Scaffold this active site. Structure first.
Site, PDB file in Angstrom:
ATOM      1  CG  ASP A 126     -10.632 -12.119   3.942  1.00  0.00           C
ATOM      2  OD1 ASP A 126      -9.649 -11.955   4.555  1.00  0.00           O
ATOM      3  OD2 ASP A 126     -11.009 -11.839   2.648  1.00  0.00           O
ATOM      4  CG  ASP A 140     -12.254 -10.346  -1.826  1.00  0.00           C
ATOM      5  OD1 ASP A 140     -12.744  -9.998  -3.083  1.00  0.00           O
ATOM      6  OD2 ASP A 140     -11.373  -9.392  -1.392  1.00  0.00           O
TER       7      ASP A 140
HETATM    8  C1  LIG Z   1      -5.998  -6.872   9.346  1.00  0.00           C
HETATM    9  S1  LIG Z   1      -6.976  -6.438   7.971  1.00  0.00           S
HETATM   10  C2  LIG Z   1      -5.832  -5.952   6.725  1.00  0.00           C
HETATM   11  C3  LIG Z   1      -4.943  -6.917   6.211  1.00  0.00           C
HETATM   12  O1  LIG Z   1      -5.481  -8.183   5.502  1.00  0.00           O
HETATM   13  C4  LIG Z   1      -4.710  -8.844   4.498  1.00  0.00           C
HETATM   14  N1  LIG Z   1      -5.938  -9.117   3.752  1.00  0.00           N
HETATM   15  C5  LIG Z   1      -6.882 -10.315   4.359  1.00  0.00           C
HETATM   16  N2  LIG Z   1      -7.898 -10.338   3.442  1.00  0.00           N
HETATM   17  C6  LIG Z   1      -7.511  -9.671   2.331  1.00  0.00           C
HETATM   18  C7  LIG Z   1      -8.678  -9.419   1.173  1.00  0.00           C
HETATM   19  N3  LIG Z   1      -9.607  -9.988   1.048  1.00  0.00           N
HETATM   20  N4  LIG Z   1      -7.988  -8.336   0.178  1.00  0.00           N
HETATM   21  C8  LIG Z   1      -6.958  -7.935   0.739  1.00  0.00           C
HETATM   22  N5  LIG Z   1      -6.107  -7.751   1.606  1.00  0.00           N
HETATM   23  C9  LIG Z   1      -6.696  -8.950   2.626  1.00  0.00           C
HETATM   24  C10 LIG Z   1      -4.024  -7.324   3.959  1.00  0.00           C
HETATM   25  O2  LIG Z   1      -2.591  -8.204   3.381  1.00  0.00           O
HETATM   26  C11 LIG Z   1      -4.024  -6.451   5.171  1.00  0.00           C
HETATM   27  O3  LIG Z   1      -2.466  -6.432   5.798  1.00  0.00           O
END
Ligand SMILES: CSC[C@H]1O[C@@H](n2cnc3c(N)ncnc32)[C@H](O)[C@@H]1O
Ligand SMILES: CSC[C@H]1O[C@@H](n2cnc3c(N)ncnc32)[C@H](O)[C@@H]1O
Ligand SMILES: CSC[C@H]1O[C@@H](n2cnc3c(N)ncnc32)[C@H](O)[C@@H]1O
Ligand SMILES: CSC[C@H]1O[C@@H](n2cnc3c(N)ncnc32)[C@H](O)[C@@H]1O
Ligand SMILES: CSC[C@H]1O[C@@H](n2cnc3c(N)ncnc32)[C@H](O)[C@@H]1O
Ligand SMILES: CSC[C@H]1O[C@@H](n2cnc3c(N)ncnc32)[C@H](O)[C@@H]1O
Lengths: 263, 263, 263, 263, 263, 263
Positions: free
Chosen positions: A214, A216
């Site tokens: 993603d 963010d």
């Molecule tokens: C399955 S959704 C949650 C997981 O996404 C990961 N993650 C993915 N994208 C992000 C983001 N933008 N910010 C923080 N954690 C993220 C993290 O380590 C967490 O275990």
């Protein structure tokens, strides 16, 4: 307190969307004793090529454990009990830079710790240790991961700063602007710390293979958990190819020493 | 998490009034790593006869640690890391029976646990163990202690039930009437449990040499901490003689059945 | 860490049904600092006769705190900070004997502790103390309470063993048969321990005035919380008369010393 | 809960490499009661010049306690019980700037707290206090330390911002770039917070004399615990001279404004 | 914080040797939200007869959770979220009397709590509740279990006192003599409390079907975990027939009243 | 565990200086069950216009609870049990910019979390949720607060970044220079996080109305608790008018859905 008879030289810690590593031919699940209680799940052990490999999904069965509740000490202690020397983490991360696109892999070389509520070490006294982590990841494993990606022609960024946040909530726009514009971070996640510190204290050669799931808060629609799982699912095949190849590439033996960190 | 190169086959855990066991010729103090944190003090290691012995005062330097705060898991773990197979505990106890005398030794064969606030096991999951403790102390070590006392002509009761209370306060009269008249316990203290439990889980052969230091609530003037320390001091020379002789009497190797305790 | 300007020589700890002691003329509520955090409520302080008295309802405003969550250490520490020398506890208890009837007062002289996992002491190290509790309540205060009851012609049993259970559930029939037929207990409650031991450690002269509010499991209909509150309410007036009279009867100064309890 | 008869107006808290302060002529070790449990070690008390001084090594005997496990509340409470008014901390720090030299002293005037897992206050309710820490250190003591260094001709930087990290691991390069280039911090360590916070709450006049023992991640070879101990040892003689002189220079009495901090 | 759409009116909590209840025809595993964290495993839900039934193995997958670490509050909370009204516990117990033989079932009617380290209630304030547990099990469910056993001609004792100990170690001979001769207990286990307490607070109708798996310390060879699993395995078929029959016999709806327990 | 009969669609969480909201015409105080224990105080419930409103002072009676000890999970859970959909927080904040003057209101639109020791979520497993908080406050409620301030001609800044610190101490000058120049924060407080997080997880529409009570370290005399209370008292009437007007302006129903946040 228990004699661990099973042995593995390589440990794989799977993150989001990687409950099943798709790398084993024959394997079994084992319970591993730790003085910190329960690892995230039983450890899957089996042979790949000429290597005995141990796998543990850090969120457990059904992704039942959030980042802030993972028993990082039990997970790393269990791998140490098995004789693990190399630890390959596969994780889902958000990108803080337009250049690190969805589905791209990143082999980070640095991190910034913004976690809050965790147990950071195996050394609480009377044996005090302060491990150096200027270059926090194992260089030899990072270099082998990079070579594997180049050999397989899988798009992969060869460096990057991972900012680890506490969670479980995702970041506000103000926080993300700070992570990027200020801390100069490239990718973001919630699970790297204290896993990487504990692996170093355990004298393991640890490295992370991150996949961008993603953007963010920076894309038209900000990151949601649904997006992370969906993107990781679209890229599981490539992740498994990279892992399978890297595991066979690793030499027998590679933070290798605690001598100068012990007070 | 660190290799322990120091080794001892016999471990002594000293109780009240026994900070200095007075059994060592040459010795040094070492810090032993445990995943439970701090043992009560640095361990004293040295050779006696042809035996390497490790000593640990459970209340620490200056008797600074009360029973309810002793890190029993760290103390037993530290001894296990040193390779200890035999653990001799020397303790101060009250007599609940009037036919015993102050200064008599008792080698208990049973216990009743009335503790409340303690961590009782090394096995919190995922490896579940339920040790058998129908006969809680190591028979071979109890028998050797009894033979030693007979050889030295030191007055010693060869059996007895130890009731372990939580503390730090001593018992009320109503509680002590229950301990003696209903439970039929013989001696009372605050430190046996979980030390004995943990030694068994660690597959050590543990036994207690208890010294009667008071009559609990039953003498004209009830037990006080001052009395316990005073009587213990009057009998330390005899305890040291018994301890010195027993240590040399022990065979190289002797609760050696975790197999049937593991679910 | 705070200089406590207010002073009281007598402390009253009110139990169930006694949020309002009905004994003060002029009074004010104050916040008292403790290193254990929050006492059950602010402390009501005021003059009665020629004495400064402090009152604290152990269950707090609206009976919001159950026995197992009371901050006993903060409550006793707050009274010590105020200079309290005498502590009178008023409590609701169940009767385990047909002879101790509803509405009867009991001035217990012994107790049996069946609580589980509460914090029992102010001395966790490095200053170790083992207070003597053979006769756990302050004799002089018990004697004054008994004399006051006799002077007021209030039916009161002059002795009794209080068994303190953990709660919050009430006892099973098998447990109550054990408390009575075996432990020889007379009355039962959930709040005496550790309040009494902490008061002793703080060198206060503590006694309990208990009122029988139910017959535990022994009446045709077993004890319920509704019954306890109802019976307590029917006897508030008598309790207040006894309290008011006892408070004025107390001499200026009366567990008085820790010397022999300190290791 | 016990009367503290010993008294000292000046307290020294020794850091790495300073277990033995080498400033006492005659002294003794005492156990000091605290409601937070165990201070790092028994306190050393003795007279120097015209003052009684108390010394406490924050890592304890054998440097057995890491920063994240130090009982900061017990250490400051113990000094307060002794009547300490001035607290001089001696610490080992890394320099984040290359114009400083190993062995230079720094008397910081500011700090930035990046700690994570600690207990930060003595005020948890019901007495709420929010101390002002705009100028966190005691100005009068900082000025006296600076004058002492000038009088002894010991190279000392007269200001600086201390960034306190959690540890026990040292910083990554990305973190250190943030500390220096973005936060503009000058020196880095792991023990200042919450020690400084607690001393202010206790109305003590606290100041730190820091010794540069490494260049963090910025020299060819990044900081290691071995380097810190080595450099500290090379400069202990000068630190002892500075300490000895400063202690005699202090006035009898000097964060003594708890009034405006109490809500 | 989650809307639970799944529903079941009957809950089965399986103990040792009953990870697979062998009663479902079609079922699925679900994750159930609780404010106490993790239930022992995911909840298996499916239809039997005209009833929707939820099953939870209290020791989790692979018997990974010992009695002292089971999250009893999360397990009962999860069942309440599903709408469970009837809870049938199947457990392994030791017999304290020679006429309650291996493989016999016991439907206890009383208990004695000797646990030490557990969380006993869902009511920690401000809503204080003291449930009345004179007859701790649900009479209607006990009576149906007894009728079922009679109809199937399965040997079953129709009453009995269960003493619940803390574990994980088994009892000493002195403790077992005490449980039998003193407390008048008939069977012994480690998991009943606080499960039964919590089910009552949740207004569920709870009963235990216990299987005698050993004679505790009273046979020539004392109880071992190996024996418990072995005997349980030899009788699983009978336990499954009893369970299957009882489940279909239950009425739609039946402790079903907290009103008088609320202060 | 108990059925909550009381209902309110709007909740008001009052901060410093707002123990009495001065908005109710008739109301009562109620105890609300939560599985996290005690909310900060009893919840005041009453009517205003056509709405039922619930009020909770986050620091409790007498401002007895500091920010780091507030039971944020119990406060938000209690409001959820009452059916609250809109949550209006009124807080005291410091200004980090000289054009956000004393007494000015600020309706922040972003935050930066610098807290350290708190419980951040209701989701600890097995149902894992990662809420999105790119725009952390409810837009509809913020817009209504802004419109209300415009209609009443009350000076209000319509955006702003709130940096939340741990406390209880106020910031050092170096930290404050960092919050402003580096993090680009506009206002500072200690209570926003995790309150806002938890409200979003509970699917409520939460917004903060902040009142500038001080200039942090930037005025000639740095912020003190006495100043914060004084300035808030000088502006209470204005805050109450804003609050009263906003409450009546809110529509019946408005982080609306957790669906995409659930893994
Ligand atoms: C399955 S959704 C949650 C997981 O996404 C990961 N993650 C993915 N994208 C992000 C983001 N933008 N910010 C923080 N954690 C993220 C993290 O380590 C967490 O275990
Ligand atoms: C030094 S006084 C305290 C010690 O006395 C021992 N002890 C001696 N007599 C008794 C007694 N009567 N009851 C309980 N503990 C006792 C306890 O184990 C405790 O560590
Ligand atoms: C208001 S109902 C609960 C209170 O009742 C007191 N109590 C009264 N009767 C009994 C009883 N039979 N058993 C235990 N506690 C009791 C306890 O100390 C508790 O604070
Ligand atoms: C003995 S090595 C560990 C100690 O080094 C101090 N220290 C020295 N240099 C640094 C540095 N670069 N970063 C953090 N702590 C440091 C810390 O406060 C810790 O107690
Ligand atoms: C599988 S071995 C451990 C289990 O045995 C049950 N148990 C069986 N027999 C006994 C016994 N004699 N004492 C205590 N628990 C017992 C306990 O509840 C525990 O979960
Ligand atoms: C009554 S003084 C303490 C309160 O002030 C608020 N506060 C006001 N000004 C500031 C500031 N400058 N920094 C941090 N918190 C502040 C905090 O949220 C805390 O609850």
């Amino acid at each position: 307190m228990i004699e661990q008879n099973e042995k593995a030289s390589i440990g794989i810690i799977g993150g989001s969307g990687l409950y099943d590593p798709g790398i084993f031919s024959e394997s079994k699940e084992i319970k591993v004793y730790t003085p910190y209680g329960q690892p995230s799940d039983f450890i899957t052990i089996g042979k790949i090529g000429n290597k005995s490999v141990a796998f543990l999904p850090r969120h457990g069965r059904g992704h039942r454990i959030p980042p802030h509740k993972i028993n990082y000490r039990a997970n790393i202690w269990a791998l140490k009990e098995l004789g693990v020397r190399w630890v390959i983490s596969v994780s889902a991360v958000g990108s803080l830079r337009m250049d690190y696109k969805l589905g791209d892999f990143v082999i980070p070389d640095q991190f910034i710790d913004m976690t809050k509520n965790r147990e950071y070490s195996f050394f609480d006294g009377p044996v005090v240790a302060h491990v150096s982590m200027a270059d926090p990841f194992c260089n030899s494993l990072r270099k082998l991961a990079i070579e594997t990606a180049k050999e397989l022609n899988i798009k992969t960024h060869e460096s990057g700063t991972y900012i680890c946040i506490e969670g479980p909530r995702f970041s506000t726009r103000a926080e993300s602007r700070t992570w990027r514009e200020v801390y100069k971070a490239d990718i973001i996640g919630m699970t790297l710390v204290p896993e990487v510190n504990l692996a170093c204290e355990a004298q393991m050669c640890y490295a992370t293979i991150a996949m961008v799931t993603d953007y963010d808060v920076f894309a038209e629609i900000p990151v949601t958990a649904e997006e992370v799982t969906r993107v990781m699912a679209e890229n599981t095949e490539k992740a498994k190819k990279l892992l399978y190849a890297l595991i066979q590439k690793l030499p027998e033996k590679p933070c290798n020493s605690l001598k100068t960190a012990l007070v």
